[PDB]
């Protein structure tokens, strides 16, 4: 269970073709051995749920009996991986869940254009981390996590 003295972030990471595993691995490299992530000198419990396959399947559901999601980090770098994000979100709709759509490193014009329309439709923030492996800068990870903590307090997640 969650330590009542340490704030918990339950983060879904959504991305096919190994995108979710890769970002989850990066984030865990930044964590303590008991999965704490430090922000502004403060410890947070960080639970990660990387998803790459069909979210219809129980094993791939956003929410489980011990995991209530607080946000979802959506990753893509291609037509197919963008399509996977839309399919997964619209199908598992989790609707007021804070979402972040991130374009990562692997056409460039169309991926940005479509990403922005998808983010508009899903009502979420769009970040271009491709210019910035298929990783994301750790400072950007911390910004997203800070944002989730405030959302968590506003939406009572
Ligand atoms: Na807690
Ligand atoms: Na976890
Ligand atoms: Na996990």
Residue numbers in the entry: 585 to 677, 688 to 700, 708 to 733, 738 to 762
What do the study authors state?
The p190RhoGAP proteins, p190RhoGAP-A (ARHGAP35) and p190RhoGAP-B (ARHGAP5), are key regulators of Rho GTP hydrolysis and are highly important for maintenance of proper Rho signaling. They share over 50% sequence identity and a domain organization containing a GTP-binding GTPase domain, four FF domains and a C-terminal GAP domain. We identify two GTPase-like folds in the middle domain of both p190RhoGAP-A and -B which we term pG1 and pG2, and show that they are important for GAP activity toward RhoA. Thus, we classify p190RhoGAP pG1 and pG2 as psuedoGTPases.
We obtained crystals of the p190RhoGAP-A and p190RhoGAP-B pG1 domains that diffract to 1.9 and 2.6 Å resolution, respectively. The root mean square deviation (r.m.s.d.) between the two pG1 structures is 1.8 Å over 128 Cαs, and 2.7 Å (135 Cαs) between the prototypical small GTPase H-Ras and p190RhoGAP-A pG1. All five G motifs are degraded in p190RhoGAP pG1. In p190RhoGAP, helix α1 (which follows the P-loop) is extended and sterically occludes the phosphate-binding cavity. Switch I (G2) is completely absent in p190RhoGAP pG1 due to an 11-residue deletion. Switch II (G2) is also degraded in p190RhoGAP pG1, and places a glutamate side chain (Glu636) where the γ-phosphate of GTP binds to canonical small GTPases. The G4 and G5 motifs are disordered in our structures, but their sequence divergence suggests degraded ability to bind guanine base, and in our structures the guanosine-binding site appears to be sterically hindered by the side chains of Glu606 and Arg739, which form a predicted salt bridge with one another. Together, the substantially degraded G motifs in the p190RhoGAP pG1 domain indicate an inability to bind nucleotide. Consistent with our biochemical studies, co-crystallography of p190RhoGAP-A pG1 with GTPγS and Mg2+ yields no conformational differences and no electron density corresponding to bound nucleotide. Additionally, reported binding partners of p190RhoGAP such as Rnd3 may bind the pG1–pG2 region and affect p190RhoGAP activity. Interestingly, a conserved surface on p190RhoGAP-A pG1 is observed potentially suggesting a protein interaction surface.
